[PDB]
């Protein structure tokens, strides 16, 4: 969490957390209930978000599901949708601990190597996370969209 980051940067210098870091922790801990409801909202609508983002991603890249693509076939498409679900779950974790650490430890670091290993193009992955952000913002509030967008953009930058 942010608490962990503050503690780690304070421990690496062999000191107690300064005043500014302590108020970082304070302000974050006062934000807890808002995030703890927002992930309620987003977990409520996952089955819809994934369903629409999936049709978007293949309207943009129809050759992925065409004969010869990486996702052509029932088994492959099911697992792309599963990847959608996993990334939405990671985004809920990231919104909970109010910074990028789950999205980085799981997800971003080493992801290009895994996808090059599997045969999924990386530009398709970037566009899929874009379509996911699209689908999620289409079904939530404007204040909630304001709160959730930077987490998607961090993923988009961490893949590229």
């Amino acid at each position: 969490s942010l608490v962990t980051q503050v503690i780690l940067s304070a421990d690496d210098e062999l000191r107690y957390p300064t005043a500014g870091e302590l108020e970082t922790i304070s302000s974050y801990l006062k934000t807890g209930e808002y995030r703890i409801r927002l992930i309620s909202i987003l977990q409520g609508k996952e089955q819809e978000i994934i369903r629409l983002a999936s049709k978007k991603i293949f309207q943009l890249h129809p050759e992925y599901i065409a004969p010869g693509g990486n996702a052509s076939g029932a088994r492959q498409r099911a697992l792309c949708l599963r990847d959608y679900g996993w990334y939405l779950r990671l985004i809920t974790y990231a919104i909970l601990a109010g910074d990028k650490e789950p999205l980085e430890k799981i997800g971003i670091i080493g992801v290009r190597e895994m996808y090059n290993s599997l045969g999924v193009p990386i530009i398709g992955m970037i566009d899929a996370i874009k379509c996911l952000k699209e689908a999620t913002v289409e079904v939530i509030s404007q204040e909630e969209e304001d709160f959730v967008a930077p987490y998607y953009d961090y993923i988009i930058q961490g893949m590229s």
Binding site: E13, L14, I109, E113
Partner: protein, 92 residues
């Protein structure tokens, strides 16, 4: 000369690890530990054996153990192999 010459908070020298080792100490530990790199997957450097058994000087064992704990490593065994125990003069 030695690490415990009065330096603490508010010194000119930055805050750091302070060994209690008497100057020119000759006490030595024998330690076994594992230390995964946890940075190789974005620097892309070649691998190295992370399982180590070595002798470390008493004057550097504390900073060494704290560095090992910083980077996620696990310490499997420690042994003082050189030097007495609770010897007042004669650690040099």
């Amino acid at each position: 000369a030695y690490d415990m010459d009065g330096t603490g908070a508010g010194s000119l020298e930055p805050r750091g690890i302070k060994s209690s080792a008497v100057e020119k100490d000759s006490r030595c530990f024998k330690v076994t530990f594992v230390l995964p790199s946890q940075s190789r997957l974005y620097t892309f450097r070649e691998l190295q054996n992370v399982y180590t058994t070595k002798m470390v000087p008493f004057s550097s064992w504390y900073a060494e153990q704290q560095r090992i704990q910083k980077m996620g490593g696990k310490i499997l065994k420690v042994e003082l192999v050189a030097g007495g125990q609770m010897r007042s003069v004669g650690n040099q």
